[PDB]
Amino acid sequence: GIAVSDDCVQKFNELKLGHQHRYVTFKMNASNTEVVVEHVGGPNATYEDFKSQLPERDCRYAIFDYEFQVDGGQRNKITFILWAPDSAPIKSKMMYTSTKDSIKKKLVGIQVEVQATDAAEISEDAVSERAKK
């Protein structure tokens, strides 16, 4: 069973507790034995900084601290994202789907979950719609 590295939780806690990162992405390590931190986005990194780097033919996990306004007040939603494009190899989708429960349960405090399989499903409009639901 693929493990989740401690650093994943550390970076997540930095985002969740310290508001230190706008987002963190995660990927399987070279040996497919552990989930590891891939990218760390600074507090002022944009939704596009995150989305533009997702691989067309591989899967990723991510946490995005999604900020929006409701009636002029600020809100945030810790959003977990499974990026699993249809064009990824079946092996890869298999690995990331079957490990999804393990990583989510270690990242305590997720408020919103999104599973995206194509460009429209990972659009900011899609995440935003799900975050203020």
Curated annotation (Swiss-Prot):
A GO cellular component entry from the record: cytoplasm
Protein biosynthesis is among the record's keywords: no
Species the sequence originates in: Acanthamoeba castellanii (Amoeba)
Protein name: Actophorin
Gene3D superfamilies registered for this protein in UniProt: Severin
InterPro entries from the UniProt entry: ADF-H, ADF-H/Gelsolin-like_dom_sf, ADF/Cofilin
Subcellular location: Cytoplasm
Self-association state and partner proteins as the record states: Monomer.
Purpose of the protein: Forms a one to one complex with monomeric actin. Can regulate the pool available for polymerization. Severs actin filaments in a dose-dependent manner.
Keywords: Actin-binding, Cytoplasm
GO biological process entries: actin filament depolymerization
Pfam families hit by this protein: Cofilin_ADF
Matching PANTHER family: COFILIN-RELATED
Domain ADF-H residues, every copy: 1-132
GO molecular function terms noted in the UniProt entry: actin binding
